[PDB]
């Protein structure tokens, strides 16, 4: 509880580098089994990296990654950690930890870290610009709304985009980023709503780069006069 | 490694249809397969593990089957939260290998879209664009044309598109389209609008402004 497993934020990282993603077990005794590696590249299957034993330390792995990925665990700070060198392109990918249940290695996955987007690029962090997309100019008539904010311009993913400070969650349609051919992302989100509240209620949507340690809080206000 | 292929790559079914997957080790592997869930943007969820052993929590209407070398998941009466990629893995053999995917969409009856267009804000058109967005809301299945026309007929090549994966509630997909200029070129014209074409509808809508607002 916080989670069960739970992982460190998206980075980007400079091809030839290296990442250290971490993974916080809490709730159960960690040193009673062995966690897992797992990446899962765009639009490729999940391809098993490595496993560690929180009890002894000890290590197995996959041997396309021979000679450049390290597992390592704080069994104080019940945290285990991957290290992945000599970064190439190909290693942007979610990489999660997952809970072998019974210590041996050799195993199903029954708990699975949320994941950590490593982005391996050049190109620098840029936090987003949010733009309102205000309900109307004058349309109502039927009996809903919708409004709604634009993120634009950031790199790399994620964004995460709140509505009311996660109070309002139905009718939430929070779209996939497109890359535009600059290189940054845009995504929006819309809310669809009963009109009769766009004049009782305030909309705020809370835009979350992680990346650039962005917060925004943007009132979608009416296209007003 | 040992492969694993699973059998389709992608099914469309109706709720309450039974679907069945398969899954080839490309060897024996006894028992040792477990079937995960996942659902667009998160993480992997075990369901089936030792072939046909149910997780804790997981609803009855999945089951597996299979030894050695052929798998099965069966999903005996399909339900819209049951939209997913699903997965199997061996752990017979290092590296432990998982198959391709089958994605489950849901079929269902055709809704047609709320559509809603959305004009350049104030503080974007400080910073020299303008984006304009035109929302389709709520619809099935999931073809729909959108023609952008600015200055009437002078309908447009310069927009991006995203949709949404398919709701676990009531299988719809919603669709944005963004048409981006530059302030220049957006005060230079004045009717901006969408124009919308889906099976659903029974004439193409159109959603335009004026720029010019009020």
């Known amino acids: 509880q916080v989670k069960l497993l739970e992982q460190s934020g998206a980075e980007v990282k400079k091809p030839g580098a290296s990442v250290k993603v971490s993974c916080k077990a809490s709730?159960?005794?960690?040193?009673?089994?062995?966690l897992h590696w797992v990446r899962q590249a765009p639009g490729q299957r999940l391809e098993w990296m490595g496993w560690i034993s929180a009890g002894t330390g000890n290590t197995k792995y996959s041997q396309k990654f021979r000679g450049r990925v390290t597992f390592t665990r704080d069994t104080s700070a019940t945290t285990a950690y991957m290290g992945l060198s000599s970064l190439r392109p190909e290693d942007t990918a979610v990489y999660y930890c997952?809970?072998?249940?019974?210590?041996?290695?050799?195993?199903?996955?029954?708990?699975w870290g949320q994941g950590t987007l490593v982005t391996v690029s050049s190109a620098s962090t840029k936090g987003p610009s949010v733009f309102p997309l205000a309900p109307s100019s004058k349309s109502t008539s039927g009996g809903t709304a919708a409004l709604g904010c634009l993120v634009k311009d950031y790199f790399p993913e994620p964004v995460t985009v709140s509505w009311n400070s996660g109070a309002l969650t139905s009718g939430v349609h929070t779209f996939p980023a497109v890359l535009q051919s600059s290189g940054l992302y845009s995504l929006s989100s819309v809310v669809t709503v009963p009109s009769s509240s766009l004049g009782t209620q305030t909309y705020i949507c809370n835009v979350n780069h992680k990346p650039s340690n962005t917060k925004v809080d943007k009132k979608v206000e009416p296209k007003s006069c | 490694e040992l492969v694993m292929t699973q059998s389709p790559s992608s099914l469309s079914a109706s709720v309450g249809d039974r679907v069945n997957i398969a899954c080839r080790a490309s060897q024996g592997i006894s028992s040792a397969l477990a079937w995960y869930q996942q659902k667009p943007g998160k993480a992997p969820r075990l369901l089936i593990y030792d072939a046909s052993n149910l997780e804790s929590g997981v609803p009855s209407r999945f089951s597996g089957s299979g030894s050695g070398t052929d798998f099965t998941l069966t999903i005996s009466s399909l339900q819209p939260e049951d939209f997913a990629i699903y997965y199997c893995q061996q752990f017979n053999s290092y590296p432990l290998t998982f198959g391709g995917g089958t994605k489950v969409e849901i079929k269902r009856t055709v809704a047609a879209p709320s559509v809603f267009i959305f004009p350049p804000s104030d503080e974007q058109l400080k910073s020299g664009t303008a984006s304009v967005v035109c929302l389709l809301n709520n619809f099935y299945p999931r073809e729909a044309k959108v023609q952008w026309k600015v200055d009437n007929a002078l309908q447009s090549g310069n927009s991006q598109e995203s949709v949404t994966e398919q709701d676990s509630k009531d299988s719809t997909y919603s669709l944005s389209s963004t048409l981006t200029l530059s302030k220049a070129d957006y005060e230079k014209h004045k009717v901006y609008a969408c124009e919308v074409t889906h099976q659903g509808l029974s004439s193409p809508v159109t959603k335009s402004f004026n720029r010019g607002e009020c």
């Open positions: 997952a809970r072998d249940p019974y210590g041996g290695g050799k195993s199903e996955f029954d708990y």
């Open positions: 709730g159960y005794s960690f040193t009673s089994y062995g």
